[model samples]
Target: VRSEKDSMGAIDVPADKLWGAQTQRSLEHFRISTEKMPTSLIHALALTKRAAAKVNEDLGLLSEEKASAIRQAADEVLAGQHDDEFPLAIWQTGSGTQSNMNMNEVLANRASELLGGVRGMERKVHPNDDVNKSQSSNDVFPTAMHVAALLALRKQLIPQLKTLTQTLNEKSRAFADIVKIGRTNLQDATPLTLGQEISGWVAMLEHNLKHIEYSLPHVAELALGGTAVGTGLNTHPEYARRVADELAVITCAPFVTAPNKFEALATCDALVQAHGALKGLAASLMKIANDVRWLASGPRCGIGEISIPENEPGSSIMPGKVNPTQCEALTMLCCQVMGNDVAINMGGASGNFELNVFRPMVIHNFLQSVRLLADGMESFNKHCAVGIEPNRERINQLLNESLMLVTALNTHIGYDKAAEIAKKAHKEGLTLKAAALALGYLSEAEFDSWVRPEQM
Candidate 1:
């Protein structure tokens, strides 16, 4: 064990730890949850540390040697070399100051090691003085929130969304000619091609993709130079732009310094808006999953208009029962995503003044939703959506049986009499063929010509 010192005092850390006093303190102080700050956030924080070091050196605020050492250590962290070093719980320090210091401590101690200095003592590279120069936890944390959330969406979510969209598109084209009964209010309505229904889902994900894309720039704005309170205190005049530009080059993303530092630090509206976009996607997914499950309800006893791939046995007691497991799983994740949006909303609303105190909560929920939504969509696509097969016989039978096909008679027989035929069919348990013929609204020949499901 080694005792590391902060202004508060010294604390013991594991002998092999790269973290310093503040990081060890947070490890002990926050025992609230097993949910640590996500590794992606820590990776983003490492990027921030590296960017800050380089920018500080460029501005002469840090020496070149310290900056180079910090970058090397941060690079090591980014390469997944120091996974155990960061364990701060999300429930600590609403501003995420401890987690921020956790990054600094890990990078600084390693930076000192890279420069042939002692580890825990800060003999050469100090966490705050080198790795965190021209930065504050207030600004750094939010900046990392934006960077990590946006990167997750871009690097993982968007590509999967596109893949799923394409899968649905192929299904839409394949099912373009298969006419099926449509339902509203859980009862049969008219008829439409299955292609049309699946196209609605495709457009939904398309619009969702656009919505998420639209909100990217907002999250791409860096709050790094805002410092302690968005005042750019203790930072060089050009630090914000330089760091943002440097980080942009590093990540190959279009990052820019926020024009209004105070608003950037004081509010998390950007994340709220982005999550609202994600929520829109979640709502669409809910509808899509429900529609799929209902269509794939049963092979013999339920709607059974479509059949999904039977991945596994559905129930232990029932034989040959296949469930819409992917749909169920996807819908459940959609519920979690929706709930995360509300969590982010509450988090965003808590930005009272000067700085939002709900920084960790907001980012955690956002990234979790992004990751879950992406993985859920991908799973449902591969397991359920891509294998959806039209039960052509069932579709044809349902289309022929629906009394709503009387809709075609509305123009020829008039709406009132058409309603009479449908109602008579419903009350007397007669087919639409028999009802329309008995009502004398149309001859069998006329019914055959006008009531074609293809025409209707």
Candidate 2:
């Protein structure tokens, strides 16, 4: 580590080590951005660490004594024993080699200490020979990335999405009889219940969830056994099975190696496919978010039709300023996830060698997207969707004033006649019923039974 002046004293780190130079330089290089890698990625690294230990055990890759030590140490690490084991700078672009070293160094040093060897005794628990014996950054990093993302999705994001869908369903049920105008291309075009509108959102999210599940088989397909260039050159024959099998147990997921390691190693189409799922989910979430926010825009301005539960004070100076902060967060989260999809796509395109050099950035951005989307869903559900209360008076008022009821008029007057009626009604600033009756299209009693918003 480089020595640097600080307020307290000169900060020093040992420079005679494999990781010290890069780690020290990374601290200086990324001085402006202190952002850590996503927790999903970190969780993935943890899974990798445990899998490496178990794989080493099955392969007889290390001496029996050292393997036993690694197993015990790995069990403790998996049990969340050492916090320091997960610390690694995220600024390096060594295709996660820095992160690999960080994990190897931490695990080896800790395992050696746990096995009655003094800390820093590389001979006792060599980082490469023991911890990373059959693994490479190309294999382990992306493998862990997939594991962590699946874990986040399976554990947090999916559940929250389900909750959001359920909330939309609840709103649908609550507004089942409440008729509202349906707009197409920002124009009031037809008759649909508020409940039906909300139900469409619910169905879209459900489809997104299914899309995520559909992509899991591919995304979970890892390339662990193909060490350097997908040839398993230095790895044992049984190494792939042991790593993936143990990994399944550790992650509680049925993770498996790709059927074709060569393609998996050289291409990132799996990530692209998974990101497409994410993009689909984001699209639905943003649509719902924007609709809800716009519908709940005002108690005295804008739509003023649906009242969102104020979860926080939206502004300080504006007096009554509870904005749709949750919706805003969700919308912004969608944009970030979409942007991350672009990054992953580029990663797929940038795979020139037998390895994908852009993997580290892809993993980082993808995991960031997953976590952001997950967190945003939870927040939106808790704050915006759950406690929302629609303003019935306002909804009725808006519905009566809307030109959309003209769609129901079509059944009585045919499409062309209904369009002329709608155009005339809008131009004259009269209700469709008034314009229809004025044109002798229908009587009041017939209008009541025919073009009534409720009947539609």
Candidate 3:
């Protein structure tokens, strides 16, 4: 083991590890979960550090040799070469100070090694004085959160949602001619084309896409250069702008410094807004999945107007039973996203006078929601939405048998007469045509002309 000293005194770190005292101390304190911070955050942190190092070098705040070493080490972090070096949990200090320090130590030790120095040696590189440079966990962590979320939304979430929406649109066209029974309050109400039902699902997803796009710009604001607090102390005056520009180029996502660094450092409203969009998406997915599960209810007993592609055996005892497993998984993921949103909302409000103490929970929940939605959309699109097949025979049969088809005759026979016909048909277990004919409400020819299921 190697000994490293910080303000708190000496601590022993693992012999082969690149991290130092702060990281080791955090590891000992927060052994709550094996889950570490997400890779997106790690990569974003590296990008932020790299941009800072470049800006510092340009400003002559750091020597060229040391800046070059820091950049190289950060590049390694970005490439995921030293992911194992950052073992801090997401449940560490609420400010993410421990994680920030963890990355700093790793980059510093790696840079030192690159310059022919050994681990734990501050002779050549220092974690705080050099690696952290002009930033504080207060600003850096939130800035990294924004960078990670924006990139994920642009590159992953948006595309996956688009693909799913496109698939639903295609299915809408494919099922356009199929007439099916429409339900209101879980009871048959009217007739609509199967395509129309799928179109409604497509509309929900389209709205979610709009909401996500609308809220993303707020998340694009970065909080860097706000050292300790909103005051840009111990740093160059142009540090935040330069770093944001460099980050934009590096990540291919538009990033701008926050308009009010004090507000940015103290509140996570941007993350909360983005997460609200995610919650909207989750609601849409839940409705769609539930609809699929209902439509694919059963092949023998339930309302099986649609067939889902079964990817698993689905049962341990019933030999031929199949379940809407993909829909089940999608709904569960939606529930999880909703739950994560609640936590994020609470965290967003936890900010106090100078800085938010809920940074780790906020970012952790935000990234989790993004990743779950991305993966769930992909799986649900491929496994369920694209493969849904209309059960034409079942749809036609149900549409023909529904007594609510008498709804088409209200204008012709008057509301009272139509209600009588519907009650007689339901009570006598007779088709609407036969009951209307028997009740003298309308002749067979008139009934056929007015209560056409296809036209209705």
Query: Against the true structure, whose TM-score is highest?
Result: 3
TM-score of 2: 0.86
Tens digits of per-residue lDDT for model 2 on 1-456? 435322345545453332323344455555535556665575577677777776676666677677767666656656666554444556566367767766676566666777778445333787776788778887777677678767777888788888888888998999899887777897776678889888899889888899999878887788898888888888788888778888899778888887888888788787788889998888888888899888887657777668777777556667655688889988998999988898789878988778777877777777787788888988888877888777889887778787777777788778988888778788999887788878887888987777677777
Q: Which segments of candidate 1 are over 4 A away from where they belong? A: 314-320, 409-424, 434-447
True-structure lDDT of candidate 2: 0.75
Candidate 3 whole-model C-alpha lDDT, 0 to 1: 0.89
Residues forming the 10-long window of minimal summed lDDT in candidate 2: 15-24
- Alpha-carbon shift of residue 371 in model 1 (angstroms): 1.1
Task: Evaluate residue 113 in candidate 3 and report its C-alpha lDDT on the 0 to 100 scale.
Answer: 90
Q: Tens digits of per-residue lDDT for model 1 on 192-264? A: 8999999999999999899999999999998989988888878789989999999899999899999999999
lDDT of 3 by residue, 170-262 (tens): 999999988888899998887889999999999999989999999988999999988788988877888989988988888888899998899
Clash tally for model 2: 1
Better of 1 and 2 by lDDT: 1
TM-score for each predicted model, relative to the true structure: 0.94, 0.86, 0.95
